[PDB]
């Protein structure tokens, strides 16, 4: 016996435990404490399934998400999908798996907190370049989303802007050696990296440790919020054993980033919301900051699957984060090939937007501390 | 034969 809301929640719970322990809860007897909130579940099982909340182009786009502690790694909430039922108890959850494109929510991570930390850039300021670029070594062009170029613009903007060139090149600057360690340090992995990883989670291989997940992107975001560190993502707190004995999960945050990097692109990200990408999951109250992120067609699948002439697109995500829990959420149909359109595109911010407002009506939304090392200087930050 | 689970909040939420 166990909540319909919960299915997904506590499939990944069975599996921590076997992992850690080598037991299995189900062929085994024990009392586990997970690190789920109940009404958080609740309150995101309303907001995909209902209407109150939000308003789905219909009743077969899916969504999947994972709510982290960024003080800890702790899994809050996650479910999988919406309006899916056939209970098959702890079938596939879609929140962790990496089989979908993240995307643009893909540059914040892969080239940009990699330059900053490594001295590519030194200000949110630094002039970037979008002008017709091809991928390195190669004469093939990276398209804005638009087909349009915008010139010399900032960091910020450029990042603000979701534009791929200057994304691209940022990438070649900081190689992609350092690049692909960086990521690690984020939960995040390939069996090899390509330009294309510049803004694309879509990998060669695909095990679980290569890719991109609801799960991974929130507990990688989080370490923007939390400061630079990166907590290893938990849903079990402890288990007791039938004879009496305890296991207590600890977790160990890693330094990932300097706090400057963290601070210098949670201040670029803040802009995402306001008069960036990110406007529709903008709330003026809540001092969060985060990234939308679009995936696209092959070329193949533009020219045999695609009919309208609209801007469409396989995968709409967003990653926003608070000064408390950091959240990832995917958005896309059970069958890539059916695209999302219109007031399809824009559920990913809302549902951001809605959970993120509950997670933090109460709380004392606060903001963040420019860092010893760092100077404002009107829109942007500089280093010292 | 059983595991109980309980949320964050030590409440059972599931028996398994
Ligand atoms: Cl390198
Ligand atoms: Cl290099
Ligand atoms: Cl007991
Ligand atoms: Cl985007
Ligand atoms: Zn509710
Ligand atoms: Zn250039
Ligand atoms: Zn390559």
């Known amino acids: ?103 643009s929510t893909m540059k914040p991570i892969t080239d940009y907190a990699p330059a900053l930390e490594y001295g590519v850039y030194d200000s949110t300021a630094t002039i970037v370049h979008d002008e017709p670029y091809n991928y390195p070594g190669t004469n093939t062009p990276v398209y804005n989303w638009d087909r349009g170029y915008f010139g010399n613009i900032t960091l910020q903007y450029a990042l603000q802007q979701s534009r ?32 294309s990883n510049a803004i694309s989670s879509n990998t060669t291989e695909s095990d679980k440790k290569y890719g991109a997940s609801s799960e991974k992107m929130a507990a990688a975001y989080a370490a923007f919020a939390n400061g630079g560190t990166y907590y290893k993502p938990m849903y079990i707190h402890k288990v ?16 990932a980033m300097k706090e400057t990097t963290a601070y210098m692109m949670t201040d670029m990200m803040k802009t995402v919301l306001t008069y960036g990408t990110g406007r529709n999951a903008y709330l003026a109250w809540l001092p969060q900051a985060g990234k939308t992120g679009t995936s696209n067609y092959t070329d193949e699948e533009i020219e045999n699957h695609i009919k309208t002439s609209q801007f469409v697109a396989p995968d709409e995500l967003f990653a926003g984060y608070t000064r ?50 760092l100077y404002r200087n009107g829109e942007f930050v500089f280093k010292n | 034969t059983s595991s109980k689970i309980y949320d964050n909040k030590n409440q059972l939420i599931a028996d398994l």
């Open chain 1, 1 to 103: 016996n166990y909540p319909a809301y919960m299915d997904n929640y506590l499939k990944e719970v069975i599996n921590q435990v076997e992992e850690e322990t080598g037991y299995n809860l189900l062929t085994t007897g024990m009392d586990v404490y997970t690190n789920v909130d109940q009404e958080a579940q609740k309150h995101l099982w309303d907001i995909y399934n209902t209407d109150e909340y939000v308003a789905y182009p219909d009743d077969e786009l899916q969504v999947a998400s994972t709510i982290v502690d960024v003080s800890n790694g702790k899994v809050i909430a996650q479910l999988g999908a919406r309006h899916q039922s056939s209970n098959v108890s702890f079938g596939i959850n879609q929140a962790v798996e990496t089989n979908r494109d993240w995307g």
């Open chain 1, 324 to 373: 408390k829990y950091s959240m990832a959420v995917w958005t896309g149909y059970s069958n890539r090939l059916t695209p999302l359109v219109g007031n399809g595109l824009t559920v990913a911010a809302k549902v951001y937007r809605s959970m993120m407002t509950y997670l933090s009506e109460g709380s004392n939304p606060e903001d963040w501390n420019i860092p010893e090392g």
């Open chain 1, 164 to 195: 791929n060139v200057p994304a691209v090149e940022t990438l070649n600057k900081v190689g992609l050696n350092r690049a692909k360690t960086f990521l690690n340090g984020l939960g995040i992995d390939y069996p090899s990296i390509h330009y």
């Open chain 1, 240 to 255: 007791v054993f039938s004879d009496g004995s305890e296991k207590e999960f600890s977790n160990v945050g890693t330094r």
